Amino acid sequence: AGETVITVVGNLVDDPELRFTPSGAAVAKFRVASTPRDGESLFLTCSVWRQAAENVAESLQRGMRVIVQGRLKQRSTVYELDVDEVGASLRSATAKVTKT
Amino acid sequence: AGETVITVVGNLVDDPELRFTPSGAAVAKFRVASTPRTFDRQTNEWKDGESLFLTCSVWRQAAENVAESLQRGMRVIVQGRLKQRSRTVYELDVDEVGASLRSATAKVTKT
Amino acid sequence: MAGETVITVVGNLVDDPELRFTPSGAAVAKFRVASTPRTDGESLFLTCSVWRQAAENVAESLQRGMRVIVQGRLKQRSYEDREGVKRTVYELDVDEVGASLRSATAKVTKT
Amino acid sequence: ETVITVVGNLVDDPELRFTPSGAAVAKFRVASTPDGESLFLTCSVWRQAAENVAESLQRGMRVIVQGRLKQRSRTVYELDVDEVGASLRSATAKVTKT
């Protein structure tokens, strides 16, 4: 790959923003705050694609705890996470899950 | 501390089984099947490889939240410590488990 | 190319790497890694295989007892053998292997 | 809290310094190229490894590093290294203990 795959756990800093590509593919962006314990927080901008993007826009909001795995990138400088998988954390919440 | 931390993504093979220790700490166990896939260029199709199975255990509040939220067949993402134990075999000591939103939505409720 | 379980393991070689070749003549080196948590705890043992140039570099550079860091893909193979014995092996398909500098130095020569 | 693995080449020779207590600490910058844009991370390793690094590694060399991803100050992302290895992808190594 040359890709840097990582996992991050934290809380959304903001509600997800849903956009679309020219082909009509959904893309949702949101910032995650990961806090080591409180030490200084790691903030990462995440983007989620396709169906997951819509499930995220609908299901998630500021303050919710997530676990995300994706590919770490740097843009020209901001560091970003291209998310491959996103889950609503069950650490301190329950979920009623509905298959799309 | 020299622990081997890994992230696994897949479907629950069975309903989580919830038990308690003598001190009263909740513990939920369940098996995750993670299926790799490769694109077959000649047939123009994604073909599935052999599934990776791991027995997971989650502790305390998370354990009860799992017993309440997850069922057989649901997709999850888990991060935790890879262990093998007594013959030896593998097990994941879960530090964090999430219900995947890849192809589902969720109503989330704190605590 | 999808749904793979990528992991990093750190530990010592249990044995000298075993160098073999595929029918096409590609090198492949197998070695088992022993990862021991300090929390000494029970060690995690994982069979690794590395390919091509790295495999040769490994056979040449590493031996039993040396400390490595490896990143690769965790796979499961389950089968019934010619004698009716049902078995399963887990294996780390290595993408990157490094000689650890935690308690060693190294003279590094590019191939 | 956020442990990651990164693979790449040293942008520069490692810089060895010491703290008031005499603890060694080595800093180097890794470039990880997916060619697309490169991910650049400043790495620091402590103690014996810091010294082994200063003696073993130089700019251009390929490494694999595992450690804790941190952010500071605008801001920059740093890797607090728990483990660093000289990659054998396109190199051989003569390895010596301690």
Swiss-Prot record, chain B:
GO terms for biological process: DNA replication. Residues 1-101 form the SSB domain. Phosphorylated on tyrosine residue(s) when expressed in E.coli. Keywords: Cytoplasm, DNA-binding, Phosphoprotein. One of its GO terms (cellular component) is nucleoid. It is found in: Cytoplasm, Nucleoid. GO terms for molecular function: enzyme activator activity; single-stranded DNA binding. Homotetramer. The N-terminal 120 residues form an OB-fold. This is Single-stranded DNA-binding protein 2. The gene is ssb2. The chain holds residues 2 to 120 of 199 of the full protein.
Curated annotation (Swiss-Prot), chain C:
Phosphorylated on tyrosine residue(s) when expressed in E.coli. The keyword Transferase does not apply. It comes from the Bacteria. The keyword DNA-binding applies. It is found in: Cytoplasm, Nucleoid. GO terms for molecular function: enzyme activator activity; single-stranded DNA binding. Residues 1-101 form the SSB domain. One of its GO terms (cellular component) is nucleoid. GO terms for biological process: DNA replication. Keywords: Cytoplasm, DNA-binding, Phosphoprotein. Its main location: cytoplasm. Homotetramer. The N-terminal 120 residues form an OB-fold. This is Single-stranded DNA-binding protein 2.
